[PDB]
Design a protein around this ligand. Structure first.
Ligand SMILES: [Cl-]
Ligand SMILES: [Cl-]
Ligand SMILES: [Cl-]
Ligand SMILES: [Mn+2]
Ligand SMILES: [Mn+2]
Ligand SMILES: [Mn+2]
Ligand SMILES: [Mn+2]
Ligand SMILES: [Mn+2]
Ligand SMILES: [Mn+2]
Lengths: 197, 233, 273, 233, 197, 273, 233, 273
């Protein structure tokens, strides 16, 4: 078991380590017969005996269950709402979920959520992502700014022990690569220097 | 027919047979494209834009276990010595297939079921090797888009000019030479991704040329890696 | 056969975002800090496409257009025997925007090409009678291909700039007597002057010069006016699903022409004329 | 080049500069079309058929809040002096877009979510101004189909011929003149719906011509209204 | 508050009235900042203090809930019937509604309603129109003629206090612009002279 | 590449309505009061399209077809150097019927054009050897474009009438020596005689001349026979998904030809010959 | 123009007017096609492949009560004396329609709701009558595929050559003759399936020719039956 | 405009069946009893298409390809005035495989045609300078149309054989002085030698010559090598979504060339050379 690199900037096909590590499957690391290569432009990190690649690149968010996500309503279907969560997959919000009851005869139009509305919502199902707005604070975004970032950069915007979130607060980050709130410039600066200091 | 290897053992642009044209690589070239790149090999210049992964509206054409790669190789009308008709030619159709299939090996398409990943390539200047320059620009554009890949793809055409095995052909060499053999691989994985020969070579020459292409490929591969790393390091 | 259909939303912007875009319009200022009458930063890189006879890479903000020319020797049309040919092709490349599918020019690329063509033609900037080699037997055909590489809004005005810039950049090669010798640049394409197209977006109560992509997604309509340096109007095209009052057009032209003077001045600096 | 303004201050067809060509309007012209109209301005003649509102089979191309307008401007091969190829030209493609967008402002499309309204226009004789004659025939065909609209659309081309601002151009004037400016509006609403200028005008001339076009438009608008009312009154 | 016209024949964009009337939304009238214009070729009518436009033009029927409609069966789907009711929208008749029970294993073919059958049916839902044949007299049209008219002309075919219906009877009108029954010619004469005597 | 597929129902008529259409066929009479052998009312408006060299607007009941001609000077084909050209184009315009989508001619418009073409050609009504200006060097090309504007049934027979009428209406302009002078009509297109196509629909036990749209929706098949005034058969086309017995065709031709005499007589009255 | 009926009352290939060209029929000709056949009439040769019944992916184009027949008549570029452009011509488009509609009468399409049955026909050699040879090859290919049919379809062109009614035309006769009348029927059912006449005939000649075509058809029909039975008996 | 997309599975073979196909590869033997280096049974029927100037029906196992030629007199290209023309067209006919929809050549038919074209061209087997009738004024154009009639795997190699066979079978007719007299065969198309393409499929650890349809459905990739009788490599095309190691290609070429000797020998027997 050997690691080839320190905290290094890494690239697709780049050999990270040789030997049998018991690494959980990652989309950022490809294992071939006891060699491990990065699959992405990223930052190689060693965590305890294991290691990872922190992707520095990626416009898309990958859906995960129970992620608090903030999405943009795209279409209003007969039984629900089609929602953009910046993923390869369009999320769907059942009307029955939002309402907490049956969709009544000729009921609604776009009064709860319209096209162009932002929604804060959790991912109730994904194996297309089905959303839920059950929890508190979830629902249509009435006010403020919704700033867009690389979803890949979200952990850096929050920071270990909220340390980055706190230094922006005194001067809501979703998993989605979207933050409901100049705050914009400081976030773009963390996007463009996540790999530094 | 021009003399391709000159009396001083050198080529029409002054190069040695084992010598590459100058390479220039830019990333993050477009605002909208999820990933993008310009790749220059000598006077051959391609730009690539990647969009995806994204759901594939023609849903019956989506794959249940896999992203569909949708690849376009295209040449601008003013990329060539004489004007190329902008309507896609058979060459562009073939090269789009060959380039897609090159990328099929590298892109971790199983990660994104029933999505499409769009790889759009434009040749802005064509002076030989543009299918490869397009392919490498595509590779770099995918890496730039954060789309997981086995490896980067590096490629060169080798060939034969006045009986001499040469690395990285000119348009003069491609036009007037005896053989033109574009090869692309995932170099760290030892895997060939694109392999064509147009023209004529003895089997021994074929194997000599194959060997030389790997040497050029490893250089290009190092520059790809260095180019991707340049904005972070 | 063919047909024009109402499109879907290619840039659905949130209700929240619409308000932010407009809400500094009071101060005469936009999102990007610029004035309602300001163009975005412009660069024009001449000779970007080395195998084109002339080329210009236009960056107007995040809009990127590469125009290139290719000259050929042709018989002139039996009706225009004392003129050469200009053929204008604009393509919206699938690289330029997420929803651009690869295909032949759609109605927008076509509209763009024809508006550029007529601006160039009706300006008399390119005098085709100058492109004759031998009257009634051989003339120059100028293929102007304008390829939009990045769709950042106001693609038309960038296409016009790239087009004009490409034409000014166009090398003419020696004709030997029947054949073109490309080892000898004997001249440059003869242009009387530059042209510019100025696009004014109608957004709420406001008129906005050079709409970015966000402004274009929220505007009622735009109207583009083309000028030559003497400020003759040389083309107008109202575009978009929405209408404009008579006074909007009156005022848009006044604002357009005012901007044209400055845009032409900067174009000339980029061209070296 | 012909003399466009003659010594007696008049035009090639005998008109004054402020004078319209004769207009003829027929409604209910086709059996099958939900609505239809023939519009004649001088020797320019269009026929329009409207079908809808109707569900839109390409359901992913339907709009959730809105009817989709599907508009076709087309010229018959024998509408022109020389035969026009029946395959749609770029001009017809552009004019179809410009005419659709004119109608987008007038048609109350929000009334019919995820439906299509089809507006098919054929130019039977082209002697200048056929995009406008088509547009007005479309407008009248929509009113004839009972499809709710903000207003009727009336339009004329103004222009410049031998330095004289003229209303409603001939083909001779359109071909040989200095400027050709089609304008269409919803006249009661003060709203311009189509606005193009081909050729060249000083800003002052532009504004003179714009003013004259409004005067012609208000006359045409009155005849549209009278024509729609004729079968009932 | 002023009205510009008597019982006049009216046209799209035609100014009807100026001032704030409390007119219920009509698709035949467009209100702009206290001016009211006709949106259609129609007959302007003043009703009490309010007014309306009676459309003289229109081939299409607009679905409304509880309208008794007579439609033509177009397709026979797996769980129901697709029905043409002369609207911009295709109506759907659930088999379960018609049957009053579950759709059994390999049950039916076209025995209840086939393609080309007329159906008399009420509109149970519309906000595509869902039909119901629950009520009496609703169901497949066995016999007689089904005559087609402009749906816009239906009120004239019935008449105020059934007065027009009665003068055709002694010598079933649906909202659909379809009448289940020379009767044909007298109806075409009321289509072409609804605006007169 | 391309392929012929079974179409959907473009006019699904109710079971109830089928019975009403046929149930006066006993009396030799149809829906519209007319006999099983009767054509619908016909009008032919010559010179309807003023910029066509010849034209005819045909109204046959609710079927409306506008045919127009355009003459051009061409080199003849090296194999037919002593003949001019006839090019027949039929378009089913999206205006004509609700389900007609805009596009290039489909198989029905194509079928129509080829059946009209061959009727006109094989009749010898238009003798192409008459259209020579200079043998082996220049001839007239007659572009016949036949545009169906209203699809009311039996479109073929209306297309043939409009076609013949358009050709008879065709002005020939003076040729100056190389160029056509359109200020001088020197002649009319030389036709030997009119042609007519007569369509007989098979409906239940009955044969119906000139099917309307309803009859066409219920017919098993139709068969069209083309005649010249001497009553030579000059084209036949069986059309439709259904078959016909040998006796149906025998009897359809007998009924067709009988109607042709009357249809030709009325055509001649409309033409002025 | 060649002499079509020679002094000895015979035709250019030596035949009598009432005489058929030699027929050759092969079945089970392709591995993949559910059913297939080669039909030779003289020097006219067609091959047909049948696939189906199978579900029809463009599901909105499927029929609820019926299989959709999807038929292609096509000629190879080298089937003719001069090269035919491989892009489908109007003739091929028309003939595909006429052949489909011929098969519509025979194929028991009600048996397979919302399926498609694909009938692909290629003319390998065209020497007159290829629409009929294609049609009969289609018929035989369908029978070979086990697709239920009312009857086989047999067909011949009759015509007139130098005033003589002739059965089963040559290319010389089709090109230079006065009349060419392809007829196809389900012979056991007395039903005509394809019927066209190109050229010119008096009504009496028409009926003489119709009679002769039925005699040839009954012979061809017997050979079709015998050919289908040959691999089992 | 156009685009290459990952296809669906046209032959989804069961997991069970994959194992059966490979599990005799140990013994150097396949499903059909043949060796890993064996081609399937080959027949070549020359002159199968009697109206082609030359033709060959190739049956390679269940793969059936019919190639035909048609010669025309053309002006040569002003840049190749001392050469005739070869135009190679390959069509995958909807007859050949269940999922082949009728249409213009797709990327696979196109790829096939271009690989065949370049094998034929770069081999110098067809020397186009031999196809001149009158230098700079008239030359022979050889239209080679290659129609795949039955898709049984390794269509490329069958196309090359049929192509070569069709060309060898091509009759040249007498030219009279301007016109071709087809009553007089004055020659045969002059070919220097046959060419063959040899396709090697990568399947698991194994290299398989001439993959059948099942092998093609399970292979990682194939690579085709074209040879002339002196065993110069005259074309190579790697095809398929999967990669191959450097050693796979090295070994595939060694195995390809070894098979070429035998395949060429059998081709010559079929050609009569
Ligand atoms: Cl290349
Ligand atoms: Cl116009
Ligand atoms: Cl035939
Ligand atoms: Mn980026
Ligand atoms: Mn040229
Ligand atoms: Mn009407
Ligand atoms: Mn011509
Ligand atoms: Mn079989
Ligand atoms: Mn040729």
């Amino acid at each position: 078991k050997i690691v080839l690199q320190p905290r290094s900037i890494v690239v697709p096909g780049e050999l990270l380590a040789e030997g049998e590590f018991q690494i959980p499957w990652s989309p950022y690391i490809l294992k071939i017969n006891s060699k491990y290569y990065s699959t992405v432009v990223g930052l190689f990190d060693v965590k305890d005996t294991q290691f990872e690649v922190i992707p520095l690149e990626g416009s898309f968010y990958y859906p995960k269950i129970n992620d608090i996500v903030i999405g943009l309503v795209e279409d209003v279907e007969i039984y629900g709402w089609v929602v953009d969560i910046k993923a390869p997959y369009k999320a769907y919000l059942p009307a029955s979920n939002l309402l907490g009851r049956s969709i009544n005869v000729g009921e609604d139009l776009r009064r709860y959520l319209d096209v162009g509305d932002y929604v804060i919502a959790r991912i109730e199902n994904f194996d297309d992502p089905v959303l839920s707005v059950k929890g508190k604070d979830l629902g249509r975004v009435s006010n403020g700014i919704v700033i867009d970032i690389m979803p890949v950069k979200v952990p850096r915007v929050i920071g270990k022990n909220k340390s980055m979130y706190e230094t922006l607060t005194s001067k809501f980050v979703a998993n989605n690569g979207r933050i409901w709130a100049i705050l914009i410039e400081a976030i773009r600066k963390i996007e463009n220097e996540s790999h530094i200091k | 027919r021009p003399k391709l290897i000159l009396d001083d053992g050198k080529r029409t642009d002054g190069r040695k047979p084992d010598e590459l044209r100058s390479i220039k690589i830019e990333l993050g070239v477009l605002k909208n494209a999820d990933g993008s790149a310009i790749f220059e090999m000598g006077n051959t210049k391609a730009i690539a834009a990647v969009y995806g992964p994204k759901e594939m509206h023609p849903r019956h054409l989506s794959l249940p276990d896999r992203a569909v790669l949708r690849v376009r190789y295209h040449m601008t009308p003013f990329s060539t010595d004489e004007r190329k008709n902008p309507a896609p030619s058979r060459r562009e159709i073939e090269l789009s297939k060959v380039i897609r299939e090159a990328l099929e090996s590298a892109v971790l398409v199983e990660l994104f079921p029933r999505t499409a990943i769009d790889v759009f390539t434009e040749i802005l200047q064509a002076d030989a090797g543009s299918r490869l320059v397009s392919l490498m620009a595509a590779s770099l554009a995918l890496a730039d888009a954060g789309i997981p890949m086995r490896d980067l793809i590096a490629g060169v055409a080798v060939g034969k000019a006045d009986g001499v095995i040469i690395l990285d052909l000119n348009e003069t060499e491609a036009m007037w030479g005896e053989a033109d053999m574009p090869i692309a691989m995932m170099p760290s994985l030892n895997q060939v991704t694109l392999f064509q020969l147009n023209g004529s070579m003895t089997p021994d020459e074929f194997r000599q040329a194959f060997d030389l292409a790997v040497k050029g490929i490893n250089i290009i591969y190092n520059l790809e890696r260095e180019a991707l790393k340049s904005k972070y390091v | 056969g063919h047909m024009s259909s109402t499109p879907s939303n290619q840039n659905i912007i949130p209700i929240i975002k619409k308000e932010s875009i407009v809400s500094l319009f009071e101060k005469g200022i936009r999102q990007d800090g610029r004035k309602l009458t300001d163009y975005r930063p412009l660069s024009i890189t001449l000779d970007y496409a080395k195998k084109a006879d002339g080329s210009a890479l236009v960056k107007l903000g995040t809009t990127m257009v590469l125009a290139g020319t290719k000259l050929e020797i042709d018989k002139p049309y039996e009706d225009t025997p004392n003129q050469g040919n200009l053929i204008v092709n604009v393509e919206l490349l699938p690289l330029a925007y997420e929803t651009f599918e690869p295909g032949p020019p759609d109605e927008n690329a076509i509209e763009l090409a024809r508006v550029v063509d007529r601006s160039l033609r009706d300006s008399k900037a390119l005098d085709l009678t100058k492109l004759v080699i031998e009257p009634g037997k051989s003339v120059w055909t100028v293929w102007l291909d304008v390829y939009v590489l990045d769709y950042g809004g106001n693609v038309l005005d960038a296409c016009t700039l790239a087009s004009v810039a490409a034409l000014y950049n166009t090398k003419v090669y020696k004709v030997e007597q029947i054949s073109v010798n490309k080892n000898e640049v004997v001249g440059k394409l003869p242009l009387n002057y530059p042209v510019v197209t100025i696009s004014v977006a109608k957004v709420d109560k406001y008129l906005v010069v050079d709409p970015d992509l966000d402004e274009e997604s929220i505007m009622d309509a735009k109207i583009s006016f083309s000028y030559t340096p003497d400020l003759k109007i040389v083309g107008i095209q109202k575009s978009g699903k929405g209408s404009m009052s008579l006074q909007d057009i009156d005022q848009a032209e006044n604002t357009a022409r005012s901007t044209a003077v400055k845009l032409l001045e900067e174009l000339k600096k980029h061209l070296g004329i």
